[PDB]
Design a protein around this ligand. Structure first.
Ligand SMILES: [Mg+2]
Length: 281
């Protein structure tokens, strides 16, 4: 393989190491598209993990800015060369929504001074920042002609995926001093996450969790209803990614909403969903 192949293989490794679900689905795309997805996804992961000082994050941002301003010049990247070389390669063939990467970077910087969200509006604003943006950047790769609708559908799906992630990770996030449910909603439902972490679930908690799960599910249905905005080859792949991730909600229920382990959809179940979907197509 070539040097560029090596850069993309590394991006693949990062994506698969982070999400078995998204790698399972997206690796089914045609070669050129899945490679572009590995590259964009790896860039988002590097941004999301950068703090663990803002030093490296600042480098990533300057690297992306160099690509945006001079896509066909050679750059001595400051952050992760393999990933930026791959992103630049993609940038030379596809329209990348650079502002969406900057919105993501801005959100991650803010996360440094994290304080609970006062309202669901702030929570959903956070979902846009860390995941709606990912949906936006992948949009040109997964569609033939991008319209505001294409971005809207991709943005909403990313945000729904983030909300499902939050619903899966209540426990581990709490251990890491983060609570994503809003203070407004916690007060309304009379839920104290630390109390639930210590004592186990109860009906108030389950009702609150289900309140958010219903939002994720409805947004998922709306996205499925508009799947035709994506290219014919990406449609079943996106449906699979979404279904695989959404199944996480049932896995949490089956584990009695436990705050003490990370539930998951086993590979065999992922293959079952692919079968059902791929049968529709
Ligand atoms: Mg999480």
């Amino acid at each position: 393989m070539t040097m560029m192949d090596m850069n993309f293989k590394y991006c693949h490794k990062i994506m698969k190491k982070h999400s078995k679900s998204f790698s399972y689905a997206f690796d089914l795309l045609p070669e050129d598209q899945r490679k572009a997805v590995w590259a964009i996804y790896a860039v988002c992961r590097k941004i999301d993990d950068s703090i663990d000082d803002i030093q490296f994050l600042n480098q990533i941002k300057e690297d992306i800015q160099s690509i945006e301003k001079y896509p066909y010049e050679y750059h001595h990247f400051q952050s992760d060369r393999r990933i930026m070389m791959a992103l630049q390669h993609v940038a030379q063939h596809k329209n990348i929504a650079f502002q969406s990467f900057y919105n993501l970077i801005d959100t991650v910087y803010k996360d440094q001074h994290f304080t609970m969200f006062e309202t669901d509006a702030e929570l959903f604003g956070y979902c846009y920042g860390v995941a709606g943006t990912v949906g936006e950047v992948l949009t040109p790769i997964l569609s033939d002609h991008e319209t505001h609708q294409t971005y809207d559908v991709a943005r909403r799906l990313g945000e729904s995926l983030q909300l499902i992630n939050i619903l899966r990770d209540v426990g581990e996030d709490f251990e890491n001093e983060r609570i994503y449910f809003s203070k407004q909603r916690l007060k309304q439902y009379e839920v104290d996450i630390a109390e639930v972490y210590q004592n186990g679930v109860n009906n108030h908690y389950i009702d609150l969790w289900e309140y958010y799960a219903a939002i994720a599910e409805k947004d998922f249905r709306d996205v499925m209803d508009q799947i035709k905005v994506f290219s014919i080859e990406a449609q079943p792949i996106i449906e699979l990614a979404a279904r695989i991730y959404i199944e996480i909600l049932d896995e949490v229920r089956q584990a009695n909403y436990t705050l003490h382990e990370r539930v998951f959809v086993e590979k065999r179940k992922k293959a079952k969903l692919f079968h059902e979907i791929n049968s529709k197509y």
